[PDB]
Amino acid sequence: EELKEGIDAVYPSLVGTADSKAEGIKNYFKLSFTLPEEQKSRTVGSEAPLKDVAQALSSRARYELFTEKETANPAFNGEVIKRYKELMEHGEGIADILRSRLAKFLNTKDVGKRFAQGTEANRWVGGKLLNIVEQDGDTFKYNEQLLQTAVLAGLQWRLTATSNTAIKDAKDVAAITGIDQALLPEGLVEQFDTGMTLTEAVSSLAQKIESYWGLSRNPNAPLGYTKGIPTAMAAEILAAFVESTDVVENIVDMSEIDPDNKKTIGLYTITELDSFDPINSFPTAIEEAVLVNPTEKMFFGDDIPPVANTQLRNPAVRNTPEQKAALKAEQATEFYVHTPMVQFYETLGKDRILELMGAGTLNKELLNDNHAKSLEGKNRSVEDSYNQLFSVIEQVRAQSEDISTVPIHYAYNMTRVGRMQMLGKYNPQSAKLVREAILPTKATLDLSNQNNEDFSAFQLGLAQALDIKVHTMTREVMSDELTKLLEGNLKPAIDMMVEFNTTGSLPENAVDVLNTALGDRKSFVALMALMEYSRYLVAEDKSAFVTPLYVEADGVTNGPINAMMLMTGGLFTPDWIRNIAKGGLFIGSPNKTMNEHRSTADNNDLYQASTNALMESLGKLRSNYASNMPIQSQIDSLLSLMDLFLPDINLGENGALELKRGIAKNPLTITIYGSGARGIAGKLVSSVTDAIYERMSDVLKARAKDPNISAAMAMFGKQAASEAHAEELLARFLKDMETLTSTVPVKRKGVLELQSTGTGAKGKINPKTYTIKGEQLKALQENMLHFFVEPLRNGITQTVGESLVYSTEQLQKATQIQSVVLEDMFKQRVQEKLAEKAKDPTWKKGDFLTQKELNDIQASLNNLAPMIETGSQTFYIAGSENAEVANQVLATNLDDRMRVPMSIYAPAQAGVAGIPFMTIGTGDGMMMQTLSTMKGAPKNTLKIFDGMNIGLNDITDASRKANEAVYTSWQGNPIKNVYESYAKFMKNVDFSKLSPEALEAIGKSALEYDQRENATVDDIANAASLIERNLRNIALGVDIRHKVLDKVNLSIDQMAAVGAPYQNNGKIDLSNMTPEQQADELNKLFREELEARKQ
DNA sequence: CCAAAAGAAGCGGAGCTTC
Ligand SMILES: Nc1nc2c(ncn2[C@@H]2O[C@H](COP(=O)(O)CP(=O)(O)OP(=O)(O)O)[C@@H](O)[C@H]2O)c(=O)[nH]1
Ligand SMILES: Nc1nc2c(ncn2[C@@H]2O[C@H](COP(=O)(O)CP(=O)(O)OP(=O)(O)O)[C@@H](O)[C@H]2O)c(=O)[nH]1
Ligand SMILES: O=P([O-])(O)O
Ligand SMILES: [Mn+2]
Ligand SMILES: [Mn+2]
Structure with missing residues (x-):
């Protein structure tokens, strides 16, 4: 314990005594931290970290010497060096702001004078930074080493924080705002997803600061200081960035949305650098200079990521040896840039990619306000993916003359639900744009004969990419569907891409060409397909065609089927046998594939099956109220409104109801996982209202094109055969909206009763401002709940x-x-x-x-x-991090604002989390873990939780291994x-x-x-x-x-597409038997096993 | 439903108060 002397030698002039028992001012920095046994940060001991690091960044030679390495990242060139010189000068600006902020704090309310007189201001929630000050005549000043190092962390955070933030969805924004998820205003999710909450901003900044300070926490020091001091520094730096306009603070007033919501919530947005900023090509020079072992970096060539010891955000949980082995395997995989797709993206350019894949240029007068906000969010996601890809490409380009030969590794960790998550927001696992430009899949194919197995593999990849549902049809049938498409609708697009792969040029109408050809098949992977097929056409040597085109083996209705296999606990039933077959567990059919099942036995998957059961439950509900005309009319209106706007609901001329699997897909899934019916009702209503608001833009666009168009043709012209038809569709809409908002079903003693809301929708519709308000949304939800969701839930259980x-x-x-x-x-x-x-x-x-x-x-x-x-x-x-344990502020900034709550790693209530934790974990999580570690583990894949992208050379064996891994997980x-x-x-x-x-x-x-x-x-x-x-x-x-x-004899094709089922080779033959016979035999075997337990 | 939590700010020096 010479740790007291050590840290005092480094910080001898800090105010106070490093003795918790001392009577006067006590220094809690020196009491809280110790020097590490092995250097973590190269700024420890530096008199002027900003000066020292600026010099290190000033040339390649100086960088190499400071980092004690032989050669720096080749992206660190002249242009990048100049940008870092300018950024270092900005660091001086942030340092200067901080110093002045301290001066103001010391002067106000005589805090400095009182502190000098023994008032323990260094222990206040806003005064913990007084632990890193030094006496300066009649006042106090920052220790320059600690201040400047903190500013360096601040600069790194400023550069790369946004790219590392979590994604906020509707559930997140509901938790943040305290507004019911179903009642969130359009674009509120988008507003909140683009910004950081105070806790989000400060915690990430604080982590960086503590890291760069390079010390270790004293385990016998109070968290109020160990966590408190760096958080206090972070709060000050965030405040300084607001002053500098590097960060914009927006205090969002919830009372403007919900008058009984008192919350005012800060959002922090980092000012984005230009997409063409050279610093984008190497944004981690500071990180990689300061830290001996940097977190933030790209992994090129043979520089491979370390294997994480603990579960993501769960420090109490060590990754198991098997989990670590899986992580190692995935981190070993080499990814490579596919130059043709990069050049294609580049040639289209950001604007045209937004037009094609986003919403293009928005003009806010042909758009409904709510719809406009969704379109803004759609553009943002695409734009951020594009910019992030091209920042990565610029760094990759510096590594070698040929970018396609630079190996790239990615870091992964295990999440709390046992999934291998690729770290970062914009990588191949998480971002579809990026997924088609950076790939681990590679094959050299013999495509000289269209009868080759190589050509069949190529076709499967193309078809899947083009939205042909390849798991539902045999390879032979797939081949013909693809050929028709390539020679038909896609041909003009293929011709264009042939020219691109010849001259490098695209026509002015390229977006239109792709849009018209692809229609609803449009996706990033579809673009890869058009690219690769066109490349094949122009290829000199078709006998050795090199392509990253892949086939994704994906779990058929994966979570639900895994639950059914892992957690069904009674005797076998024939309904279970039929339903589990929908998920690719085939009993008594050696070598049977999902492709064969779908084409010859049962064309209805588990979600379609539940939709059929919903249709039965709905019929039963109607019969229960047959004589009740108001109830019948209310059900009719709900189904009418859904039919008007949703693709997966259709009503025939004579009233025949048709439902597609899509309406049950998420509801079935999340019901198993513990969702209430109300939440599902909210989501279905949101999908309806989304489509209504979009239709309102279609109106504004029709009126601009033709001022003398009727409201019926403006809203239902594209939907109707004639005009009289558009008139009856419009009448339907208005009638539906009126009754569904003015009247709601309420359950009273097991009976549905209609009640007046008094808040029904009436008035002329202004398509621009049209918004379905909270009370009317609640009414739609109540109708949806009792007349659609409850029947669906009954179907789900069945x-x-x-x-x-x-x-x-x-x-x-x-x-x-x-x-x-x-x-x-x-x-x-x-x-x-x-x-x-x-x-x-x-x-x-x-x-x-x-x-x-x-x-x-x-x-x-x-x-x-x-x-x-x-x-x-x-x-x-139970593992969580929450503010409820300490119930106190950790630190504020020096203006008595940015009050960060003290959060502690502690158990908290699970709620329903146990179900998805265990189902995702021992299902798809265990499957993927097994895939990464099993004998003959497939190489050169990308795993996306229940789907795995496979190179065209290995589709058969890797698919069979995937199905084996399913079988392995089904032993859990x-x-x-x-x-x-x-x-x-x-x-x-x-x-x-x-x-x-x-x-x-x-x-x-x-x-x-x-x-x-x-x-x-x-x-x-x-x-x-x-x-x-x-x-x-x-x-x-x-x-x-x-x-x-x-x-029993099993053929497993849950990881479907390729038609490569795993055979368990069970010796008991249940072929040539009905599910009833099979259930009987299985139950005989069950009882026989049950009587073996007994004795 | 799950994969990550998460109000601001005066006065005073914590935590009650009001918006
Ligand atoms: N807890 C949740 N899990 C989800 C949700 N969406 C997907 N998943 C999980 O991921 C699994 C795979 O998702 P996919 O996108 O492949 C759709 P799924 O496999 O259910 O059916 P297919 O359409 O046949 O692929 C799914 O079965 C769930 O276990 C969700 O909203 N909540
Ligand atoms: N636990 C959850 N997993 C999800 C959720 N949403 C998606 N996922 C998983 O991530 C995978 C990728 O989701 P995508 O958004 O790409 C939907 P897509 O049908 O395009 O994926 P594929 O199944 O890979 O074809 C998906 O298949 C699931 O395995 C979710 O809400 N919860
Ligand atoms: O294209 P699918 O059949 O693998 O979803
Ligand atoms: Mn799936
Ligand atoms: Mn999937």
Whole structure:
């Protein structure tokens, strides 16, 4: 413990004494940090970090010497050096702003004078930066080493933070704003996704600052300072960036949206550099100079990423040896630029790519306001992908003369749901634009004979890219569908691309050519197909055609099928056998493929099946209210409105209802995963209203083209046969909107009753400003809920099985109950430590606990089995980071604003998270992990969770391996894993110790509704043990089912497209049998196995 | 439903208050 002397030698003039027990001013920087055993940052010890790093950046030679390396990134050239010189000068500006901000803080309310007189201002929420100041005559000044290093971190954050932010969707924006997800105004999601919240901005900035300071946290120092000091620095730097206009602050007033929402929420947006800024070609020079082991960098050639030790954002969970092996395998894969696609993108240019793939140039007077905001968001995503691709390309271009031969590696980590996530927002796994320019897939094909297997592979890739659903038809049938398309509608586009691949030029009408040819087949991968086919046509040597074109093996209705296989717990039923076949589990059909199943046996997948069951439930609901004309009319109007605007709903002339799989796809999925019906109703309404607002733009565009067009032809001209037709479609719309907003169904004692809202929609429609307001949205949702979603939910249960639903319920309940106890006990042990600390004269409220103290509290939870283990994966369902544990501000800026809450890694309630955690984890997660690590693991692939892109040379074997990996995952038993954790929990939990809040939360899960009011401790303890019994029985059933299934002849084609099924070679032959016969035989084998347990 | 949380700001020196 010579760590006190060490850090004092480096920072001898900081104000105060590095002694927690001292009477006067105590220095909490020196008390909180220590010098590392091995250098982490090259700025430690530097008198002037900004000067030193600026010199290092001033030339290649100086950079190489400072970094103690032989050769710098070749992207670090003259133009880039000049830009960094200018950026360093800007660093001086930020430093100067910070110094003045400190001066102002010291002067205001005499804080500096009081601090000098012994007022412990350095322990205030806004004064923690006084721990990094030094006496300066009658005042104080920043330690220059710490300030300048922090500014360097600030500059790196400014350059690359935006590219590393998370994506905000509707759920995220609802949590942030506190506005019900279904009622979010159009473009609010887009507004919030483009900016950072205060916590988002400060936490990322603070991480950078602490990293560059290059020290280690003292485990016996309070988090109020270890986390507090760098956060305080970050808050000041964010404030400085607002002053400099590097960051724009927008305080968004929620009361303008919902008058009873008091929240005012800060959004921070970094000012974007020019797309042509040379700094874009190497944006991490600072990072790679300051840090001995940089995080932010590209991995070129044989520079490979390290393997992460812990689960993403879950430091309590180590990646298992098998997970680390999978990560290593994926990080080993080489990606390469496909020059033709880069040149194609480049030649079209950003504007034309936006026109083709986004919304083009928006003119805000032919657009409905709400629709205009969605179109803005669509442009943003495409533009950001384009810009990010070309920044990467500029860096790749510097590495070699031939960009197509520069290997690129990507870092991955395991998420909390066991998926291998490629890090970054704009990479091949996450961004479709990028996916068609940077690829690991490569093959040299013999395309000289259209009868070759190589040519068949080529065709499969092209067809899939062109939106032919290749898994639904045999290879032979696919081939003919592709040929017709290539020689038909696509031919003018192919001709254009042939010319491009000859002269390098595109015509002025290139966008129109592609649009007209592709129609609804338009996608980035479709562009790759047109490119590659045209390249083949002009190829000199068709016998050795080199292409990155791929085939994606993708899981057919993957999550739902995995749940059905992994968690169905009773005896076998013929309906389950038929339905699981829809997912590619074929019993008694050696070598059967999904392609054959779809073409000869059953053309309806699981989602289509549930749609059919919805149609039955709907009929039953109508019969229950046959004599009720108001109810019948209300149902009619809902279905009418959906028919008007949604592609997956169709009503025939005589009233015949037709539904496509698309309406059930997400609802079925998220229902299994614990979604309420209300949320689904909200999403369906949003899809309807999206289409309405778009149709309103179609109106404004029709009126501009023709001022004497009728409202009926302006809104329904493109949709109608004649004009009288457009008139009856318009009448429908107005009638539907009136009744669906003025009247709502309410359930009263199991009966639906119509009620007047009093807030019905009436008035002339102004297509420009037209917006369906909150109360009217609520009414649409209520109609959608009771007349569509409830029937759909009934259909869902019928399709996936009541047995599965039961398993998922018990899983949810157990994991929720456990998480409630974990959360409450953590909080109680925290409050108990804080009551002790309140006796410590060295401790002040706002100082929190130490890391050791928190580590001890987490370790004390271990007899409650917080972790779920499978043998190859670890899940921590309760793991979170939240502000509710410390319930206090961590730091503010020096203006008493930017008040960052103190967030702590702690267990929190799971809610329904246990279901998707376990289903995604032991399903697609385990499948991919197995694919990366199994004997003969396919090489040169890109994995996208339940889909895998395969090079054309290896489509057969890699597909068969994928199906084998499915079979391997289907040997799992997530319920058994949950049970083993819950069983340990149950023998160590003391329900009497729980707070009243925790006991109430467990009551909801463990008890029937008529039990919460009067709940005793012993009642809910008894109820919790009952769930343990339920889990044990389900787990036993699953085990038997898997064992029995393994004995039988199986052909598995869940990872479909190629027609390469995995055969388990089970010896019991169930061929030439109905599902009823099969179920009987399987159940005989079940009982036989069940009687083997007994004895 | 899940894969990441997440109000601001005066006065005063924490945390109540009001918007
Ligand atoms: N918890 C959630 N999981 C989702 C959601 N969307 C997709 N997924 C998961 O990813 C899985 C694969 O998604 P895909 O895009 O391939 C669609 P899916 O496989 O369900 O059916 P196909 O259309 O046959 O591919 C899916 O089955 C779910 O387990 C979602 O909104 N929430
Ligand atoms: N857990 C979740 N996974 C998702 C969700 N959305 C997408 N995904 C996963 O990411 C994969 C890619 O999603 P995309 O947006 O590209 C939809 P697409 O049909 O184009 O994907 P493919 O299945 O690869 O054809 C998807 O298949 C799922 O496996 C989600 O909301 N939750
Ligand atoms: O093109 P699909 O059939 O693999 O989705
Ligand atoms: Mn899928
Ligand atoms: Mn997929």
